[model samples]
Target: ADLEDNMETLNDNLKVIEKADNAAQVKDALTKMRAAALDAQKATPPKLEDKSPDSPEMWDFRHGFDHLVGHIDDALKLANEGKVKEAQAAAEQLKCECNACHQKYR
Candidate 1:
């Protein structure tokens, strides 16, 4: 999906942004990432009420997905406040959350 691809690209951009020398560069990259993450969230399929949380697919679709997106949102907030260091930490945590979820559920 295009949204999925955008998410990956956003993650890459975030990594670069974390190391960016200027606040403007970091802000620009974070803006792009926030947009991408919002788009991805909008594109996500509707949740099935009948799905069990214990199910691997459900875990990925529900908890993991929400957590990853929430982290992205937090990162954007921190970046918007010009808290670059905090944003970078959140980005790393988001990356780890993504990896752990994929490893466990994908």
Candidate 2:
């Protein structure tokens, strides 16, 4: 459920990013994405007792998820500072982090 919600936010942010014409739009989208990611992080269970090696829910809580959040924050900072090109590059890197996390856990 949390993953689904986060995916929706990601899809929405992608649309915003695609339509962005200037730094402001990118910044707005990044802000929204950050908020959504934080919410998803909060929703995640602290730990799962019945851990399964192959379970998608078995996240590396110490690293993977927090790393993705950091990527989002980095992108947001770049965008907010009106660094359009740099922000776009960071956004691409952030997307890569998301993809890596999904590949590992989802």
Candidate 3:
């Protein structure tokens, strides 16, 4: 979770989610991500780099932050239920959170 701010760790977790062989493995991946996300939820808003006019949108702010965690939670729940494709879809949505957040913040 402390690695929540580390993109490298985040990327690795995402890869785990993708390559997981079974529902249990997928749950493991989801648990790792959710661990980070749970911390992020309790933490303060990060002060990010400066944004130029052409900078992409930041999703860390406002609505997306909470929703991102919830999306991960949902995915984890789906994985817990042994729902593979549905869990995959939820994980995909979780990436959307990453995309939106990093576009401006990172």
lDDT of all predictions: 0.66, 0.71, 0.67
Task: Residues 13-51, candidate 3: write the lDDT tens digits.
Answer: 888888776898788877777666656544334453353
For candidate 2, the per-residue lDDT at 10 reads 76
Q: Pick by TM-score: which candidate is best? A: 2
The CA root-mean-square deviation of candidate 1, after full C-alpha superposition on the true structure, stands at: 4.7
Please estimate how well model 3 matches the true structure, expressed as its whole-model Cα lDDT. Answer: 0.67
Superposed Cα deviation of residue 85, candidate 3 (Å): 2.2
TM-score of 1: 0.62
TM-score of each: 0.62, 0.74, 0.70
Candidate 2 segments whose C-alpha is farther than 4 A from its true place: 43-62
1 versus 2: better TM-score goes to: 2
Candidate 3's C-alpha runs over 4 A off are 1-6, 41-63
Report the lDDT tens digits of candidate 1 across residue range 1-106. 4555866867778678768766567667766776665555444333434555565656455565567667777877887788888877877777787677556533
